Write a structure and sequence with these properties.
The complex is a heterotetramer, with two copies of chain A and two copies of chain B (418 residues).
Chain A: H1 6-18, H2 26-37, H3 45-52, H4 56-65, E1 77-82, H5 85-90, H6 92-103, E2 116-121, E3 132-135, E4 138-141, H7 145-152
Parallel strand pairs in A: 1-2
Antiparallel strand pairs in A: 1-3, 3-4
Chain B: E1 11-13, H1 30-35, H2 40-46, H3 50-59, H4 72-80, E2 86-92, H5 101-108, H6 110-124, E3 126-133, H7 138-153, E4 169-174, H8 184-191, E5 215-219, H9 220-232, H10 234-238, E6 249-255, E7 261-265, H11 271-278, E8 288-293, E9 297-300, E10 321-325, H12 330-344, H13 350-367, H14 373-383, H15 393-397, H16 400-408, H17 410-417
Parallel strand pairs in B: 1-7, 2-3, 2-5, 3-4, 6-10
Antiparallel strand pairs in B: 6-7, 8-9, 8-10
Helix pairs in contact in B: 2-6, 2-9, 3-4, 3-6, 5-6, 6-9, 12-13, 13-14
The chains are: A alpha+beta (156), B alpha/beta (418).
The complex binds acetyl pyridine adenine dinucleotide, reduced (2 copies), ligand FNR (2 copies), iron/sulfur cluster (2 copies), FE2/S2 (inorganic) cluster (FES) (2 copies) and sodium ion (2 copies).
GO molecular function, one term (chains B, D): 4 iron, 4 sulfur cluster binding
Protein name (chains B, D): NADH-quinone oxidoreductase subunit F
Cofactor (chains B, D): FMN; [4Fe-4S] cluster
Chain lengths: 156, 418, 155, 418
């Protein structure tokens, strides 16, 4: 059977102990799992369900519902590119083009080394700084291709 | 110590209240907050009865800053007429297009929000409070967790706060990508560890919420007003702005303005003043074509002299001002709004489920000039028929802004039909 | 001079508390000072009688213990720590803020007899330097705005 | 119900013993103390002989936490070799600069202290115990009075405690502004209703103390260890920290650190670790210049690698850690130490009386740049001659820290001589 490495299991248990009820920790746990693995491994869900004392189908449904979670593609760094109205107006397409020039990938794709995945997302609430992208937890205004290139060089 | 990178959103205030510290783009920790007289309102509040606090918030005229403008004191009164235990929820899911007012409080002056939460929880007799922060605000999450520990250190949280006998813990939950989890009942479902499916209302959360118990949900900005109301008293607070819609208000301005960012202004400010007096006018001094109030309304250049208040003829909503100028294609803009709703319907209700999808599907065809005659008449019909049977505000409004563009910019739409 | 009934009773409680009456001397003087806002010189003779001690024993004790004040009546004593840690962390800022708000310096009483500033040695709250007390309440000084609100609680 | 305001001192523990409850800045009442297994050490103690309890405390290696580090068990043994009646005194006068470790036990976990007093009193055959708490801890006084009543009501004090036939009353006395009343013999004089004048030692209080009877005086922190020693047994207690200097220790850290407060750590911790690993390093990440061990010792930045134990090369004292950084004027700091001793000499001994006075008076002239050459030589002479004929530790050490600053920071002093 699949088992969580102890360093991850410890963190999962912290989340589970944090709220008054175990099941409230489900999203924090799933975030933590995706942080660890670069995606949600299908196999991870059964042990998580046990820890949450939830049925597996409940956990599966939750993973399916929430768009931040990814069961398909392993990626070290997720480049979330906002495709909503303000970033669109102010130059989402220039950001995507710059990203294709540097990395050779389009939205939904992963680089051959498994390092970068471009993820199109709705409004990230930084619209004054459009066009906006995140790299994992870090968030930035796109200025130009040379600028983007320098930022991405910081992720190794 | 170290938080994820956050863009440095410009912020400006004429009132120096909510943005007194948050006008500076950095985390203000508890020592800086205390030096500015922070948590003295909490001490004052704990020497008042919960009922007096509710009375003050009521008389302040404070209304929900999350977008609907429900009177806050009145919401509290509805909660406390029901037997406890009761819960207090801070809604930090802020995911409306163009909307970034709440994150600058969270990320720069977290103690302002926390103080507000403690006072509000005391007012309604809640000993357990939650912040639900959207998953795409990771920095906000870590900043709040750290701030909450600071508040614990200093005895503003925990049992028997400052010898008052009042107990409170604040739990920080994270969203995971669903706009709909900002709808107060879907938010509660998510806090309960489930999919974010809105519940039929009534009942309202104040009657039946988290674990079926009386629950107040309030927006970040609403809660951040509460320390001022206590500190100044309700009368002094009511001196700020018009006496029917009093208090500071945050306006997130984006798109084709010279100075995009968050403006703290009174609600008698006009939309024209927001754009031209505060936000520096338009990029290239082009003419204003339209303003999108998030994804809710579309105002034309003929509608700029309206007040930024919660009146029938006022701007209303979140105060979100997305400026489009004369060269911005309105149908292209409408498509993006359709794409937004397509992506966020939870799909419980059939007209919302299929309507949000078809509106986006058909508008894409129109925009690309692949639409048939039926696709056109179909788009019109679907746009008018998303709302039926809907149990939440998303289905109620998914066609609203787009309909307003059809009515206010017929010439541009016609270019796409002919 | 004679103590009011409510105070006499309170003094008698202290005197009855320890096995021997004379052990209650300091609790008694704290009570007198709390009541009057200082130690009345006339109060000592009746206290001596109650403790079954000679008058000058009592006088010697009052003189010895720095918390007791026979000179100045004050409703609120603002005890300001002037020892090493509070000095390092900004005693002088606190004193200036106090002068800005109240118009007095250490050792002085406001004209209305409401506040007296008393410089004291380490108050045992050095992590929260600079420290002050207002009668029995103790606080960290953060700023003049913060201090002003605290003092406004004392009417 | 209500107590006077107390600032919320930060507290952190790696051992979860003395600060298991007191890490939280609030009063823990008897029910919450009982829920954590409190008073079961007392029950166990009362089923033991006094002699066995003394033996365990002895074998624990517990040493006096009031600063001298005298072996506690040995002290108790000395007392019980002398005929009764005997008295037990808890020293809560804590007035050393930088020292605030005892008050967080008193104010947050009073039952830990009370339980320790009852066990210690039983061990030495005392039916009458005292807490002497400085007058500037008014909240601590009320908290202890209330806790004592709680313990009476649950039958832990009074006659025939829990059917044992052991009688105990704990009386709480207040100081009134005199640092010297923490010296054990001056404390006793004060308890006897007199001025706080130290007595010639020997005799030690264990031979002749309160009313001339065998009397044990122990520090608050010392006594707070006693429940643990009974609860876990002495073997298990000795397995905390190094085998020779065992058990938890409280370290009150103040001055130029990021996280000033009280730390519960084992005594193998180094001074460097206290400052950098636990207290978060220095304000502004400035270089450490000196640590003042209260008003007793001054350590330089070259002595940071020493253990916080009672060994000859160790930190010793109360564990008080006052951090000065590179900008801090050492002469200005020495003046504050001189002023402290000037203010607290009881005046019985001539060199102490005149020495503490002249040290401060002359050092102030040096500081203000108004000192003559004879004032300089006079200052030096007086610093070296406070101690002769002294009958207590104040006269013995009133020049000690200042002398150490003269030796360790010659450059800074010479700058003042011009
Ligand atoms: C900030 C942000 O990202 C977003 C904000 N919104 C805003 O959400 C608003 C719609 O919210 P909702 O559907 O909650 O509105 P409502 O009018 O039904 O209720 C407003 C508040 O008042 C309470 N309330 C309303 N009627 C009540 C009653 N009869 N009794 C008790 N409480 C009542 C209700 O529970 C809620 O807290 C719109 O105006 C948008 O501006 C929408 C999406 C995202
Ligand atoms: C916590 C606080 O506010 C302060 C603490 N101190 C500390 O007080 C210490 C000096 O205290 P003292 O003069 O009492 O020390 P000591 O070494 O003479 O005796 C310590 C204890 O051991 C007993 N003792 C020592 N030798 C003894 C003997 N032969 N027989 C019996 N008891 C003995 C003695 O009676 C006292 O309880 C210094 O190290 C300071 O750190 C000083 C000022 C304020
Ligand atoms: C689809 C959808 C999404 C959201 C909302 C509504 C709907 C229909 N609401 C409004 C929310 O339901 C509720 O009215 C407020 O949180 C109540 O707080 P105030 O009364 O505004 O302080 C809402 N409110 C908020 O504070 N933050 C948010 O992110 C959202 N998101
Ligand atoms: C001037 C002066 C002042 C104090 C002390 C000494 C001197 C010289 N001592 C130490 C005290 O005399 C005695 O050693 C201890 O109280 C004994 O208890 P422990 O053996 O440390 O538990 C002391 N001890 C303490 O517990 N609290 C205090 O406030 C003081 N103050
Ligand atoms: S109206 Fe739409 S978003 Fe709201 S509950 Fe129904 S399907 Fe879900
Ligand atoms: S050494 Fe100083 S403090 Fe101690 S008894 Fe003598 S004069 Fe008093
Ligand atoms: S539209 Fe992209 S961050 Fe808002
Ligand atoms: S030096 Fe001021 S409280 Fe200690
Ligand atoms: Na921000
Ligand atoms: Na002074």
């Amino acid at each position: 059977e699949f088992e969580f490495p102890e360093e991850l299991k410890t963190k999962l248990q912290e989340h589970i102990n944090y709220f008054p009820k175990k099941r409230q920790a489900i999203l924090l746990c799933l975030h933590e799992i995706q942080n660890y693995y670069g995606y949600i491994p299908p196999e991870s869900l059964k042990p998580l369900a046990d820890m949450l004392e939830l049925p597996l189908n409940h956990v599966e449904g939750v993973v399916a519902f929430y768009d931040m979670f990814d069961r398909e593609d392993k990626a070290k760094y997720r480049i979330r590119v906002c495709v909503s109205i303000v970033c669109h107006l102010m130059g989402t397409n220039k950001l995507l083009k710059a990203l294709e020039n540097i990395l050779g990938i389009k939205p939904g794709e992963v680089t051959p080394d498994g390092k970068f995945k471009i993820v199109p997302v709705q409004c990230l609430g930084a619209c004054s700084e459009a066009p906006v992208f995140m790299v994992n937890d870090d968030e930035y205004k796109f200025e130009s291709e040379v600028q983007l290139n320098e930022i991405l060089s910081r992720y190794t | 110590r170290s938080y994820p990178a956050i863009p440095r959103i410009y912020a400006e205030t004429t009132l120096n209240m909510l943005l007194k510290r948050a006008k500076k783009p950095r985390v203000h920790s508890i020592d800086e907050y205390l030096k500015d007289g922070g948590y003295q309102a909490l001490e004052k509040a704990l020497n008042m009865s919960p009922e007096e606090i509710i009375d003050w918030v009521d008389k302040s005229t404070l209304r929900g800053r999350g977008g609907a403008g429900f009177p806050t004191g009145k919401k509290w009164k509805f909660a406390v007429q029901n037997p406890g235990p009761r819960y207090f929820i801070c809604n930090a899911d802020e995911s409306e297009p163009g909307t970034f007012k709440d994150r600058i409080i969270i990320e720069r002056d977290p103690h302002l929000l926390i103080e507000g939460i403690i006072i509000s929880s005391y007012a309604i007799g809640a000993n357990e409070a939650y912040i639900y922060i959207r998953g795409e605000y990771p920095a906000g999450y870590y900043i709040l967790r750290d701030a909450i520990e600071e508040a614990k250190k200093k005895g503003f949280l925990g049992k028997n706060i400052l010898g008052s006998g009042f107990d409170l813990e604040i739990y920080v939950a994270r969203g995971a990508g669903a706009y709909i989890c900002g709808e107060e009942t879907a938010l509660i479902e998510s806090l309960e560890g489930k999919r974010g499916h809105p519940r039929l209302k009534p009942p309202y959360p104040v009657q039946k919420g988290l674990w079926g118990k009386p629950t107040v949900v309030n927006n970040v900005e609403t809660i951040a007003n509460v320390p001022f109301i206590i500190s100044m008293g309700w009368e002094e607070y009511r001196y700020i702005g018009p006496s029917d819609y009093a208090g500071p208000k945050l306006f997130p301005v984006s798109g084709k303005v010279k100075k995009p960012g968050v403006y703290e202004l009174p609600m008698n400010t006009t939309l024209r003043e927001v754009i031209f007096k505060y936000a520096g006018g338009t990029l290239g001094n082009k003419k204003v074509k339209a303003v999108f109030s998030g994804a809710l309304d579309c105002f034309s250049s003929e509608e700029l002299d309206i007040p930024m208040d919660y009146s029938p003829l006022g701007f209303g909503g979140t105060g979100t001002v997305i400026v489009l100028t004369e060269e911005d294609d309105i149908v292209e803009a409408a498509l993006k709004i359709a794409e937004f709703y397509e992506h966020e319907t939870c799909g419980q209700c059939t007209p919302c489920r299929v309507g949000c999808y078809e509106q986006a599907n058909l508008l894409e065809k129109i925009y690309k000039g692949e639409a048939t005659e039926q696709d056109w008449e179909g788009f019109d019909f679907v746009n008018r028929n998303i709302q039926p049977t809907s149990i939440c505000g998303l289905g109620a409004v998914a066609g609203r802004l787009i309909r307003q563009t059809l009515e206010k910019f017929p010439e541009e739409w016609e270019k796409y039909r002919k």
